[PDB]
Ligand binder design. Structure first.
Ligand SMILES: NC(=O)c1ccc[n+]([C@@H]2O[C@H](COP(=O)([O-])OP(=O)(O)OC[C@H]3O[C@@H](n4cnc5c(N)ncnc54)[C@H](OP(=O)(O)O)[C@@H]3O)[C@@H](O)[C@H]2O)c1
Ligand SMILES: COc1cc2c(cc1OC)[C@H](C1CC1)N(C(=O)/C=C/c1cc(Cc3cnc(N)nc3N)cc(OC)c1OC)N=C2
Length: 162
């Protein structure tokens, strides 16, 4: 199974200056719950933003740099290598990988950040015409988690004749 895992705002912003535009602990918890025990594929810039591999899961980084080697990170040099990875693979970011993979994935785990942030990187446009909402769950707000957010699990719709 190949899935997208992403948080994007009302305008599909996902990043600003190589960081998340928002501070939202609940969403990183969401990420931890979904991806622990599985595989993350991410582009080089996303990896450098985080700075180190996320524990208790396989970290795969896509880059054209053959000098790339990081302790605890598997490196690939092409999209095609993604399909050789076993188990549940989450496309983790950033904009470039999402653009490259959105027409290829089975489903998407999207956190809609219900706000408008300054961004310089975006998730590609998509329509609920093409994606079934398997689930939609409002995130709970508190003192530390003040931005409204909704967890979507979207599954690609089958094209059929009507
Ligand atoms: N859910 C979210 O909100 C979320 C998730 C992840 C990231 N982000 C954000 O997204 C932003 C970064 O996105 P980005 O598009 O600038 O960077 P990115 O996709 O993380 O990384 C781009 C790099 O990935 C490598 N790459 C991509 N496609 C490749 C291919 N086909 N073959 C070989 N290498 C390939 C290249 O590395 P080399 O140049 O080293 O070859 C490329 O420069 C950051 O602001 C980050 O905060 C947000
Ligand atoms: C080596 O030790 C640790 C290092 C770390 C951590 C824990 C450790 O040990 C427990 C925490 C962990 C959560 C505790 N951590 C993160 O979660 C980072 C999350 C993160 C994710 C994304 C992708 C992403 C976010 N959202 C959703 N919806 N989809 C996605 N595809 C992007 C980021 O930046 C550009 C991130 O960076 C902010 N950062 C380092």
């Amino acid at each position: 199974t190949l899935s997208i895992l992403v948080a994007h705002d009302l305008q599909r912003v996902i990043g600003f200056e190589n960081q998340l535009p928002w501070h939202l602990p609940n969403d990183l918890k969401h990420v931890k719950k979904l991806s622990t025990g599985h595989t993350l594929v991410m582009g080089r810039k996303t990896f450098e933003s985080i700075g180190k591999p996320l524990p208790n899961r396989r970290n795969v980084v896509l880059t054209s740099d053959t000098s790339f080697n990081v302790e605890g990170v598997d490196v690939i040099h092409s999209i095609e290598d993604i399909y050789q990875l076993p188990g549940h693979v989450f496309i983790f970011g950033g904009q470039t990988l999402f653009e490259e993979m959105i027409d290829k994935v089975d489903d998407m785990y999207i956190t809609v950040i219900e706000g408008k942030f300054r961004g310089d990187t975006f998730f590609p446009p998509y329509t609920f015409e093409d994606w079934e909402v398997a689930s939609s769950v409002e995130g709970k707000l508190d003192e530390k988690n003040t931005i409204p957010h909704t967890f979507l699990h979207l599954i690609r719709k089958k094209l059929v004749p009507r």
